[PDB]
Design a protein around this ligand. Structure first.
Ligand SMILES: Nc1nc2c(ncn2[C@@H]2O[C@H](COP(=O)(O)OP(=O)(O)OP(=O)(O)O)[C@@H](O)[C@H]2O)c(=O)[nH]1
Ligand SMILES: Nc1ncnc2c1ncn2[C@@H]1O[C@H](CSCC[C@H](N)C(=O)O)[C@@H](O)[C@H]1O
Ligand SMILES: [Cs+]
Length: 92
RNA sequence: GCAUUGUGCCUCGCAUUGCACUCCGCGGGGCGAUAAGUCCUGAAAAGGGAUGUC
């Protein structure tokens, strides 16, 4: 899948509260650069998954490559590139 | 306080590995509380449920 501004993460611990799951993800991936938003819902379609929207695709790539399979909340993170640009990016 | 309702949150059981920004699994239970909010007020960046009826 082609490099993107947004990394799509899944195999996440569905039992983590939404507000808390976001600030973790943020605090964690801010290592690899600046973050424009994190999209997270705990709906049936969107639980266990998250969208981290980087400012620069370089950041996302280093994030994808470094944090792949990382032990996060007793599960190994599965990180791909998003299949499409996030809305906040296309409006630019 | 009772009716209807928008919008999101938390928990438990079963279920779910799911590509979103067009956003609600089923079922118990608990929620105006800026927590959140996809809903509302305001053109000013912030703020907040609403109509009804004692
Ligand atoms: N019967 C009746 N009781 C009310 C009403 N509003 C508040 N109460 C009383 O208020 C208690 C609940 O508190 P709240 O509803 O939070 O009061 P509030 O938010 O200031 O209510 P409002 O003044 O109507 O905006 C209840 O036990 C009621 O007895 C009302 O409109 N009718
Ligand atoms: N945003 C909010 N903050 C706090 N409590 C809320 C709330 N939205 C709804 N409630 C609670 O839910 C009650 C309405 S019942 C509505 C539940 C929900 N819309 C559903 O369809 O499943 C309110 O009287 C209060 O008990
Ligand atoms: Cs529920």
């Amino acid at each position: 899948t082609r490099p993107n501004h947004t990394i799509y993460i899944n195999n996440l611990n569905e039992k983590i509260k939404k507000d808390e799951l976001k600030k973790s993800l943020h605090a964690i991936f801010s290592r690899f650069g600046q973050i424009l938003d994190i999209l997270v819902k705990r709906s049936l379609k969107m639980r266990g998954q998250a969208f981290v929207i980087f400012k620069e695709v370089s950041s996302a790539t280093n994030a994808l490559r470094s944090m792949q399979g990382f032990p996060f909340y007793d599960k190994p993170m599965r990180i791909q590139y998003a299949k499409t640009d996030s809305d906040i990016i296309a409006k630019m």
